[PDB]
Amino acid sequence: RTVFSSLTVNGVDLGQGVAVRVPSSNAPVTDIESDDIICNTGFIQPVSKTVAAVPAGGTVIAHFHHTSAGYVGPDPSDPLDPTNKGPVLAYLAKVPDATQSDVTGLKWFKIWQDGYTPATRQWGSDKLFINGGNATFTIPSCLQAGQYLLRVESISLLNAEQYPGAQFFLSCGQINITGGNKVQPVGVDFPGAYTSTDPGIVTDIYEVGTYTPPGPAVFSC
């Protein structure tokens, strides 16, 4: 169990809950056909009306912690219990307004992931743990400026030998990409991008040799 609940943009911490729709619970989403797979559900109200300005090319940190409160001191399961092996992923979708309530029917492109590295037997989740819940990635330099949602996700595959089983821990940040260029990548639907036959979603982690995280290939300029 883990929750993405704060952002840092080019080394500046925005504050707990700022520009993120923070779920009230650290309970996972498990239904990949639910609209809950888009940006989670049950947000702490009132939801932030901050939209973080981020230059295209800028470095973002999405902060995960064990609970929706963020950092509350030492905890052996903060940011997650590292027995929960799996990937970490980040997607963007262009939106008319990053504070709009309706997140359905958006087109999501993947900008970062960290899956499994066979030679070191290390998962993205292990690195997230080592990094104190910091999922650090760059916003592609060539993107069209404007408002976007930033969907960042930690998947636990501990119970993923069947479907349902995989546990999806995700939130959406609210950003305004500045500068940039004119690229508007092709995206995928949520729900829809993840299916019950995807071997990134149904897998035995005690039988992993190679692993491919679910969803489309990472977009890069």
Ligand X SMILES: O[C@@H]1[C@@H](O)[C@H](O[C@@H]2CO[C@@H](O[C@@H]3CO[C@@H](O[C@@H]4CO[C@@H](O)[C@H](O)[C@H]4O)[C@H](O)[C@H]3O)[C@H](O)[C@H]2O)OC[C@H]1O
Ligand Y SMILES: *[C@@H]1O[C@H](CO)[C@@H](O[C@@H]2O[C@H](CO)[C@@H](O)[C@H](O)[C@H]2NC(C)=O)[C@H](O)[C@H]1NC(C)=O
Residues that bind ligand X (CB under 6 A): 21, 41-43, 47-49, 99, 101
C-alpha dihedral (140, 141, 145, 149), degrees to nearest 10: 20
Instruction: Report d(CA 19, CA 54) in Å as an integer.
Output: 12
Burial class from Cβ neighbours inside 10 Å (0-12, 13-18, 19+) for residue 33 reads: exposed
Which residue in the set 16, 25, 41, 59 belongs to the binding site for ligand MAN (CB under 6 A)? 59
Specify the DSSP element, H or E, that contains 127: helix 124-130
Q: Provide the token pair at 190.
A: 């949520």
Count of residues touching ligand Y (by CB under 6 A): 6
Smallest distance, ligand MAN to C-beta of residue 218, A: 16
Q: Which of 207, 186, 165, 208 is nearest to 92 (CA)?
A: 186
The 133-152 contact track toward ligand MAN, x by CB under 6 A, reads: -----x--------------
Q: Is 61 in the site for ligand Y (CB under 6 A)?
A: yes
Smallest distance, ligand MAN to C-beta of residue 138, A: 5
Minimum CB distance to ligand X smaller for 101 or for 197: 101
The 5-34 contact track toward ligand Y, x by CB under 6 A, reads: ---x----x---------------------
Instruction: Report residue 123: phi and psi, to 5°.
Output: -100, 160
Contacts of 148 (CB under 8 A, 6+ apart): 92, 93, 94, 95, 98, 175, 176, 177
Q: Provide the token pair at 108.
A: 């999501």
Minimum CB distance to ligand X smaller for 21 or for 85: 21
- In the region spanning residues 107 to 166, those forming contacts with ligand Y, defined by CB under 6 A, are 131-132, 134
Contact partner, 8, from ligand MAN, ligand X, ligand Y, none, Cβ < 5-8 Å per class? ligand Y
Smallest distance, ligand MAN to C-beta of residue 178, A: 14
* Binding footprint of ligand Y on the chain (CB under 6 A): 8, 13, 61, 131-132, 134
* Binding footprint of ligand MAN on the chain (CB under 6 A): 59, 138
